[PDB]
Design an enzyme around this catalytic site. Sequence first.
Site, PDB file in Angstrom:
ATOM      1  N   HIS A  62       0.733  -1.283   0.041  1.00  0.00           N
ATOM      2  CA  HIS A  62      -0.031   0.203   0.116  1.00  0.00           C
ATOM      3  C   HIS A  62       0.838   1.367   0.020  1.00  0.00           C
ATOM      4  CE1 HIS A  62       0.200  -0.497   4.679  1.00  0.00           C
ATOM      5  NE2 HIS A  62       0.603   0.601   4.374  1.00  0.00           N
ATOM      6  N   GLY A  67       3.184   5.577  10.302  1.00  0.00           N
ATOM      7  CA  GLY A  67       4.631   5.565   9.690  1.00  0.00           C
ATOM      8  C   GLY A  67       5.106   4.027  10.214  1.00  0.00           C
ATOM      9  N   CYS A 105       4.267   1.361   9.487  1.00  0.00           N
ATOM     10  CA  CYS A 105       4.128   0.116   8.525  1.00  0.00           C
ATOM     11  C   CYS A 105       5.127  -0.273   7.989  1.00  0.00           C
ATOM     12  CB  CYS A 105       2.980   0.734   7.440  1.00  0.00           C
ATOM     13  SG  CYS A 105       1.522   1.409   8.078  1.00  0.00           S
TER      14      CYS A 105
END
EC number: 3.4.19.12
Lengths: 305, 305
Positions: free
Chosen positions: A41, A143, A145
């Site tokens: 993503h 942040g 991820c």
Amino acid sequence: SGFRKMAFPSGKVEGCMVQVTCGTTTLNGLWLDDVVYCPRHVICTSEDMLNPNYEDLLIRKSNHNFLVQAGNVQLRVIGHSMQNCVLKLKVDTANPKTPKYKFVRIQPGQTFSVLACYNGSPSGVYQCAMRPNFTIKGSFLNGSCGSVGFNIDYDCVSFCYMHHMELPTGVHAGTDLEGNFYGPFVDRQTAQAAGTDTTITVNVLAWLYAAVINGDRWFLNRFTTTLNDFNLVAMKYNYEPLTQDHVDILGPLSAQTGIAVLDMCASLKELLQNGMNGRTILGSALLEDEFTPFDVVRQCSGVTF
Amino acid sequence: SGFRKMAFPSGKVEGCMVQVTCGTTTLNGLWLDDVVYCPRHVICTSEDMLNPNYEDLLIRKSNHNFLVQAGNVQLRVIGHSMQNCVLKLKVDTANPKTPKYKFVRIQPGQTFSVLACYNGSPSGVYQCAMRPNFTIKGSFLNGSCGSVGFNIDYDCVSFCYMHHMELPTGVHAGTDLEGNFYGPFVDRQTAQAAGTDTTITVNVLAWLYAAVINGDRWFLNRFTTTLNDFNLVAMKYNYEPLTQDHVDILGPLSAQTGIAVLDMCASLKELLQNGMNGRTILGSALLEDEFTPFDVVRQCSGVTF
Ligand SMILES: CN(C)CCCCCNC(=O)C[C@H](Cc1ccc(F)cc1)NC(=O)[C@@H](Cc1ccc(Cl)cc1Cl)NC(=O)[C@H](N)Cc1ccccc1C#N
Ligand SMILES: CN(C)CCCCCNC(=O)C[C@H](Cc1ccc(F)cc1)NC(=O)[C@@H](Cc1ccc(Cl)cc1Cl)NC(=O)[C@H](N)Cc1ccccc1C#N
């Protein structure tokens, strides 16, 4: 003596964390040899994230759309590809700090260390268990991820988790390193609910054994019970039913303490039915279920009190 | 979202851990530039440990009495010296992985990360607080001596603890990296008792603020109190009295949540007087006092719910 939530030393993983930027989206990637792994993503904008078609979005990207930084050093992307929910970015440099590693998928009830990272920079380490409903109760901000979860066995890092998202309940969901989600989740910005969770019984018992090894004995009693009679109480308190294989996994702890598993089940029965009445076990006022039998053996003395 | 006991990433410290052997005694050392730091009781035999005179024992040693290993690589000792309870072994090689570092002594109530090590090999990482009685509630087995505790601020490692011993109560005592013990302890194999401990009030309040930031609100109330009226209750429950400086340290959390410190003190008052009545806060059933205000800010979102 003592018993703490204990993570694996994070150094071998710190050397693999990079920052991956696509457009205005920035998250973390995992750099092993000449490949960077990150959540796919990262290619989505804010509008794309509501209902992304990732095959379309990726086909519209080129290598030059991906900025990869290992510190201030920029890494040149020479190829990109998708594997399930993970993006794989081929870079021109093999990571000189690549450890021995495996990609393994873990089972509900197993634990792992999380290296929390922001903008490619490790910020903290902690232990997590995979819940029976395939979520983890992590500590993650925007942040994070691309942060990864791992175990270490003999200088081999077994990567088992890449972080993708936080659910409305505040728990966290992600994938294995092949990009397959744990649990019934998808990488879209839509409200998704996990299944009902349960308490990991074998872990609670392991933790009671840790307590005895450390000299916490107040909860023991002379009673024993049967596997079937205990599992009746487990159902009543939303615990997972106990299997003979769990009894065998608990064998080493049962042998070191001299307390049979079905003996310890009787004590858990009474703890469930009566609470703690003000007392604590290993510094906790509730029954802890995020330590595996392996975690107890790994950390506790090999000789009982 | 979420709140976990979170350690600093351990990599910068893993690169400094070595094994120090003198005779049949083996423990861990900390290798910075061309100096290895370890507990001086590595020079003691079992008989020496009951009542050692360290000045005598050291004078009877030469450099060749000390085997230092960084992995399988042996390090040649070229000089030795004592600084309080720490032995300093000069080696012929500067550690190429030496981070930026400071030796700082911490205050009771402050936290740090512990890299637990055995035979020079890091095995786990966890968070510790220095208790008001100058002990830590660690997790250490035989052979962990020489493991260090640290904080990391901007790639500078501030070393604050070297582990020396476990007391009869199972808590742990050690020194700063200048070799000065925390608390009224000495490095002899004799039974030593710590002073009575107290609960770190400012940390409990920080943790209540973490809970609110994460959306745990059930314990709040409309009442406010005064600094003097709260400290009356603190004395009754063996909490440390609250100072105006603690209120100021808590300012940023008070401002982010909009809940005044003396407002939160009223809620702690009621939690102390009534217990939790079955409910939990951030997954705990007791009041947690090993998170500083800095730990909360560092880990929690900067925007409240
Ligand atoms: C404790 N109790 C009492 C209260 C519980 C507190 C609950 C409050 N929780 C939230 O608001 C988190 C919030 C919930 C939510 C989820 C879906 C939806 F439709 C609307 C809201 N979810 C996101 O915002 C997600 C959105 C997202 C984005 C991409 C994809 Cl591929 C998937 C998703 Cl789902 N964003 C990220 O997950 C980011 N990647 C990383 C991130 C961002 C912001 C905050 C945390 C994290 C993490 N980690
Ligand atoms: C939880 N509740 C319910 C029960 C609590 C459980 C209590 C049981 N605790 C113990 O038995 C630990 C035991 C207590 C003890 C202390 C003094 C004494 F006279 C007799 C016994 N202390 C040691 O044996 C010490 C001995 C020692 C040696 C050198 C010096 Cl310079 C100082 C010391 Cl003090 N040894 C180390 O500390 C070793 N270096 C490292 C070590 C060894 C063994 C075990 C742990 C560690 C560590 N870490």
